[PDB]
Amino acid sequence: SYDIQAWKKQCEELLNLIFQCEDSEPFRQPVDLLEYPDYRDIIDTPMDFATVRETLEAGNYESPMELCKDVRLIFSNSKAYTPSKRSRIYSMSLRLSAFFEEHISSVLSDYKSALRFHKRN
Ligand SMILES: CCc1nncn1CCNC(=O)N1CCN(C(=O)c2ccc(C)s2)CC1
Structure with missing residues (x-):
């Protein structure tokens, strides 16, 4: 299955599934700097799932590896900002990360396989 664009x-479709997950609710929009006034002192690069979807739809990802780096940044930002491992929003991030990683693995493998096939000769 060597479709380089698939x-x-x-x-x-995976972003659609993430938006249906109740665990995505806190990550569907950029963090509100009014409610979390110290957010940008800790977090150098904010990221959220609406920004990832807009970047994809604008044609501003070249590969699924780039999309994966931005999604992983959502989760590392949550882990760095959490005042506790036993926090609600952080705990939701860990379940959503597991779901995302389970589903992205085949997308990455198929893409890299397709690119190797394109440069086989
Ligand atoms: C637009 C407002 C809105 N309306 N519905 C949801 N959101 C969420 C917007 N994002 C946001 O405000 N968040 C707080 C920071 N955060 C964290 O990862 C945290 C880690 C642990 C903590 C104690 S907070 C990400 C979610």
Whole structure:
């Protein structure tokens, strides 16, 4: 299955599933700097799932590896900002990360396989 472009719709469908997950609710929009006034002293690069979806739809990802780096940044930002391991929003991030990693693994493998096939000769 050597379609070099297939990752994009695969990533659109996975973002749809993430938006249906109740665990995604805190990550569907950029963090509110009014409620978390110290957020940007800790977090150098804010990221959220609406920004990832807009970047994809604008044609501003070249590969699913780039999309994966931004999604992983959502989760590392949560882990760095959490005042506790036993916090609600952080705990939701860990379940959502497990779900995302379970689903992205085939998208990445198929893409890298397709690119190797394109440069086989
Ligand atoms: C637009 C407002 C809105 N309306 N519905 C949801 N959101 C969420 C917006 N994002 C946000 O405000 N968040 C707080 C920071 N955060 C964290 O990862 C944290 C880690 C542990 C903590 C104690 S907070 C990410 C979620």
